[PDB]
Design a protein around this ligand. Structure first.
Ligand SMILES: CCCCCC(=O)SCCNC(=O)CCNC(=O)[C@H](O)C(C)(C)COP(=O)(O)OP(=O)(O)OC[C@H]1O[C@@H](n2cnc3c(N)ncnc32)[C@H](O)[C@@H]1OP(=O)(O)O
Ligand SMILES: CCCCCC(=O)SCCNC(=O)CCNC(=O)[C@H](O)C(C)(C)COP(=O)(O)OP(=O)(O)OC[C@H]1O[C@@H](n2cnc3c(N)ncnc32)[C@H](O)[C@@H]1OP(=O)(O)O
Ligand SMILES: CCCCCC(=O)SCCNC(=O)CCNC(=O)[C@H](O)C(C)(C)COP(=O)(O)OP(=O)(O)OC[C@H]1O[C@@H](n2cnc3c(N)ncnc32)[C@H](O)[C@@H]1OP(=O)(O)O
Ligand SMILES: CCCCCC(=O)SCCNC(=O)CCNC(=O)[C@H](O)C(C)(C)COP(=O)(O)OP(=O)(O)OC[C@H]1O[C@@H](n2cnc3c(N)ncnc32)[C@H](O)[C@@H]1OP(=O)(O)O
Ligand SMILES: NC(=O)c1ccc[n+]([C@@H]2O[C@H](COP(=O)([O-])OP(=O)(O)OC[C@H]3O[C@@H](n4cnc5c(N)ncnc54)[C@H](OP(=O)(O)O)[C@@H]3O)[C@@H](O)[C@H]2O)c1
Ligand SMILES: NC(=O)c1ccc[n+]([C@@H]2O[C@H](COP(=O)([O-])OP(=O)(O)OC[C@H]3O[C@@H](n4cnc5c(N)ncnc54)[C@H](OP(=O)(O)O)[C@@H]3O)[C@@H](O)[C@H]2O)c1
Ligand SMILES: NC(=O)c1ccc[n+]([C@@H]2O[C@H](COP(=O)([O-])OP(=O)(O)OC[C@H]3O[C@@H](n4cnc5c(N)ncnc54)[C@H](OP(=O)(O)O)[C@@H]3O)[C@@H](O)[C@H]2O)c1
Ligand SMILES: NC(=O)c1ccc[n+]([C@@H]2O[C@H](COP(=O)([O-])OP(=O)(O)OC[C@H]3O[C@@H](n4cnc5c(N)ncnc54)[C@H](OP(=O)(O)O)[C@@H]3O)[C@@H](O)[C@H]2O)c1
Lengths: 272, 276, 274, 276
């Protein structure tokens, strides 16, 4: 893996390189962090991407690196997942450029550490809007604009925070638990349109804004990482492999599932 | 086996036999959002029948006034009716100040306020989804958060969140409510962990299909097909609001001194067998 | 927190929060009722008008319990020797109970076995013995109860379980696995037996003072008190607290509750180290 | 549009790689129940990815017939062994013989199980305990022997085949639901203890799968099954190849960061299937 939002210098295939040949994946948050590596790894298996987030310069920069490293197409778009007309405009544009969308990865999210007693009403609601309503919004627009009529696959990038009520995280754990339930609800309603919907819940991942923001001090982090079952942080590529699995015809019979890829961290990490 | 008595409407029970001691919550005060109708009305009544005063808070001032008169009249306890939207933190803050000025303490918070309706996820508008999130999830947070600041942080207290089982199986026509209620269940865990040291217990209670409630009216669907699924459910009957109020009273009371961070399902096993 | 005593002795006083007649003239059959949690459960039931049958392997253990329980409460306590793994002995014990009281209203599956052991060092027979006592044994007394009385008259079952299996607690593969099976069993029996008017729920305790489980598995005093003070309610639970939640589930106040797992652990599984 | 399958315990007559065919190159997988149903298809698919297999169950005819077909179809080695997961000394012999023959074991798939429909009231103690013994004690016995004999010192991957039965307490299945739920917990326990020796442990819980003894015994009548399958999210039964794909994913370097997890691969079936 690479720490920054840059592409791998080399890659060995474990899935066939034509696994998503000529498919198109729409990736919210695909300009940094996990969403960046997911876009890269999809493109190394023949997939074209659309990457969409608020920051136009961020997606433009990412798109040039992704296309450069892989030779597939990456369409960068500016859109806030909370603004349905912008989501609609983005999906219209993707359809016009590529003609099809096969996979939606809902990776956009926001998080920060804060005691629940100190978190403002707006702060709590901002996270629910971005993670939960934003995931609903983008799924809801895809369904309507393409997936209802053509089938499709969704992966929701979630978390394990809500499992044990991770301190300082009431906002993110609540929103992410909402998205996991949302995964089952959509899996039930939309499966008969040939749409699969699963969640993938990463553990602590090196080279991501999430870890830089939420990981805490270095010394306290190593101790919890060393006491976790695989004894290390996960990396962006490993997460992208799991997401790629779930988005691919190799998960043809998998829907309504939450796959945890955390190295067993949620089983042992401290809380309180 | 006979359930305890209930009445279909938002009226008090004409008789009641105690199974908890009548002084279980002697002179305590409970703040109940949505205490003017349905489950929250019956919760308020049963609490007041165990010695508790209540504050009942929801949007509609006529609704809580009508409710408050009935509740005091049937129980000899004090009920303060307050108009307050759980989504509007200045309104929640003013309602909590008024309650504390009236009573000088609040011991229990019941988050019962919510919104729901049947709608396919493919026809649900963005505003519709978000509105449910706002009332169930953000409103429960806002009221808990304001209670924390104004009293519980310094004095302890007990929260009971009224949730649902909708999200366990992804119940059709219900993505909004099931998502909202699953967030609240996580919030229960989160607050129990952070607020435990302040002597605050937080739990969820998740009801099954309940007779005499607007949620059954709106969500239960056609009578004949509702009967089929109830009869096929393990206790073969709808729950009633008084049964749900007993489970809430259990969690809100010193009988649950060691219960925090837990979700108690009171649904007669419905989620295990209902169709999806 | 309501008072408790460390030993298998009755409370010297007790404040009622349920009505004293909550279980008037019911009969509860309680496996493991001669020590620890089950003994306090028998006591608290009997202080609510209920008679008890307490059954475990050691007749000495249940004889001395029954004497203490009947003396403290003025209700009846029948002590029986019975291994939950042994259908003929389980059948005999339930026949005796019915001969004695003419009814059983409530079953509490509290009998269990446990100890700390790393998975790689645990023998095949040690793993299977825990499975046998906790899971097959609970099934055994439950089905025997069904066939002899609950099928035709209704009843209530509470299974005492654990949170060990949620995060896969180290040194506890056997007990975590066994208790997660009983929680599934709770849902299965609730479904099949609900239409005969039988409710089935699980109660999963946290770390409880005054118990063999805490003595055996709590570990050194100083690492125990560190995790305890780092847990949400910052204390151990006590046996009276668990009995109160068990009594709740066993009682008509939980008329609409079945197939549920109620966790009573002061939030300890959310925060305890693994 | 699923990958192809054959109904009987025969190899696929054609195949298209979606994983690289060297994904498990020169590894050895020990598979209990590897001579029929889902375990047969796991062995084949692993063999098509460069893996040698050892298949172990009670019936020698079964695993003899299987190992010939598997070697024939793939060009890899398949060591068949009579072995009862319930007998530790036979488990120890079989693992010793696998290690003698191959020099290594990389992967363990615990697929051996037993099941049948029976109401709890008609299920005897011995019947319940039998299913607990094969499914739970057996999966423990095999993992424990592998651990000591090889995985402790060399690392490894275990996949336990489980089920969703215990989620909603599926009728007529108290035995299998209980045993499988115990296995999903053991997955978590083993991952926590054995992770630091470089061993991953995950569960894979299949839905109703065509071409299996489990479907034949449990699926019930055709008409009633079709109805429930047609009303499930993907509107079809899973097949053995799809399950093999998921199991291979978990057993492979693509799942390097996955441990203590349960992957449900059931086409959403547990969400909607009736629990009559
Ligand atoms: C383990 C990780 C898994 C979980 C998910 C992730 O990791 S995501 C990985 C980490 N990456 C990110 O979060 C990247 C994207 N994040 C963001 O954009 C931000 O952090 C954000 C979510 C607040 C930004 O959104 P917006 O611009 O919409 O909102 P804005 O900054 O106006 O803030 C809205 C409210 O949140 C409050 N707020 C913002 N930061 C806060 C903080 N650190 N602690 C407390 N409260 C805070 C603000 O004060 C304000 O409340 P008031 O109005 O009361 O002042
Ligand atoms: C097991 C069963 C569990 C049941 C438990 C429960 O959850 S609660 C028990 C049920 N009782 C209830 O009171 C349900 C709550 N009552 C309500 O409907 C609530 O008052 C509410 C959720 C709509 C909130 O009302 P508001 O006045 O804030 O909102 P408003 O009426 O402006 O509607 C907000 C958005 O929702 C959409 N909307 C409203 N009703 C809708 C419906 N039946 N089907 C589809 N969409 C609907 C609206 O058109 C609007 O979207 P646009 O902007 O697109 O027009
Ligand atoms: C936080 C939640 C925790 C809750 C706590 C609980 O669940 S209840 C916990 C507290 N209470 C109790 O356990 C009291 C009852 N316990 C018991 O009776 C026993 O300890 C028991 C569980 C083993 C059951 O006794 P049995 O007579 O049936 O079994 P027996 O004595 O033959 O032992 C069976 C196998 O287990 C192994 N064994 C026994 N104790 C062991 C130990 N401390 N460490 C490792 N292995 C052990 C034996 O060596 C033997 O294996 P070999 O044949 O291979 O030699
Ligand atoms: C939707 C999700 C689905 C989930 C999927 C799954 O897990 S199912 C996938 C697995 N499917 C299978 O292939 C099952 C194949 N396995 C089998 O060998 C058998 O059914 C078995 C486990 C019982 C066989 O083992 P044994 O030969 O050791 O057992 P044996 O016949 O001696 O029986 C042991 C005890 O069980 C009782 N028993 C056995 N079969 C029974 C039945 N159909 N109904 C009632 N009781 C039965 C016996 O009478 C005896 O108890 P008494 O001593 O009282 O007489
Ligand atoms: N890192 C971890 O250890 C970890 C652990 C568990 C879960 N996760 C999850 O993994 C995902 C990515 O995490 P990360 O650590 O990789 O953080 P990251 O790089 O900050 O990714 C979050 C992305 O969200 C986009 N985004 C935020 N708000 C948005 C909005 N309103 N509309 C559209 N786009 C928005 C951001 O781009 P803009 O700023 O340009 O909008 C950014 O690319 C998140 O879903 C997170 O919850 C991460
Ligand atoms: N009935 C069931 O079968 C069932 C099943 C599972 C869960 N539940 C849960 O049970 C609780 C009670 O539901 P119920 O069926 O009895 O329905 P209900 O009578 O309609 O109660 C909901 C209450 O919420 C109040 N409310 C709605 N929005 C609000 C807001 N923004 N601010 C403040 N108050 C608000 C309403 O009063 P105003 O209109 O006056 O504001 C109302 O009194 C809910 O949490 C519900 O999700 C019910
Ligand atoms: N203490 C805690 O912190 C804690 C935490 C979570 C769960 N629990 C659960 O609470 C319950 C009681 O635990 P405890 O700590 O109070 O331990 P305890 O006093 O040792 O109780 C266990 C009882 O089970 C009986 N028993 C054991 N094997 C038996 C068999 N084969 N047949 C019949 N009876 C059998 C024992 O009596 P005989 O020796 O006379 O048979 C003993 O009375 C158990 O289910 C335990 O798993 C306790
Ligand atoms: N088929 C489904 O729809 C479905 C659904 C959920 C889960 N599953 C699970 O998938 C796995 C395979 O099931 P299947 O439906 O494919 O049925 P299956 O072909 O009968 O497979 C079960 C295998 O277990 C072996 N076995 C049984 N007891 C054993 C013992 N004591 N020791 C060693 N081996 C033993 C059997 O062989 P011997 O008789 O030769 O020992 C048989 O090969 C099972 O774990 C089952 O629980 C299946």
């Amino acid at each position: 893996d690479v720490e920054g939002d840059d592409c791998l210098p080399a890659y060995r295939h474990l899935f066939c390189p034509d696994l998503l040949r000529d498919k198109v994946a729409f990736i919210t948050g695909g300009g940094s962090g996990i969403g960046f590596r997911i876009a890269e790894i999809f493109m190394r298996h023949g997939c074209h991407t659309v990457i969409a987030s608020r920051s136009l310069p961020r997606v433009l920069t990412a798109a040039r690196k992704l296309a450069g490293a892989t030779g597939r197409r990456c369409l960068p778009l500016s859109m806030d997942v909370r603004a349905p007309p912008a989501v609609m405009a983005a999906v219209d544009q993707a359809l016009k450029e590529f003609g099809r969308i096969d996979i939606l990865i809902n990776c956009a999210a926001g998080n920060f550490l804060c005691p629940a007693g100190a978190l403002s009403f707006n702060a709590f609601k901002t996270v629910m809007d971005i993670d939960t309503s934003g995931t609903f919004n983008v799924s809801r627009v895809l369904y309507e604009k393409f997936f209802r009529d053509h089938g499709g696959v969704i992966v929701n990038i979630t978390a394990t925070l809500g499992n044990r009520g991770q301190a300082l995280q009431v906002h993110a754990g609540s929103a992410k638990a909402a998205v996991d339930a949302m995964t089952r609800h959509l899996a039930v309603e939309w499966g008969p349109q040939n749409i699969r919907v699963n969640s993938l819940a990463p553990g602590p991942i090196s080279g991501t804004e999430g870890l830089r923001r939420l990981g805490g001090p270095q010394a306290s982090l190593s101790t919890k990482v060393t006491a976790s079952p695989l004894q290390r942080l996960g990396n962006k590529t490993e997460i992208a492999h799991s997401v790629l699995y779930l988005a691919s015809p190799l998960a043809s019979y998998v829907t309504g599932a939450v796959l945890v890829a955390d190295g067993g961290a949620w089983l042992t990490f401290p809380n309180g």
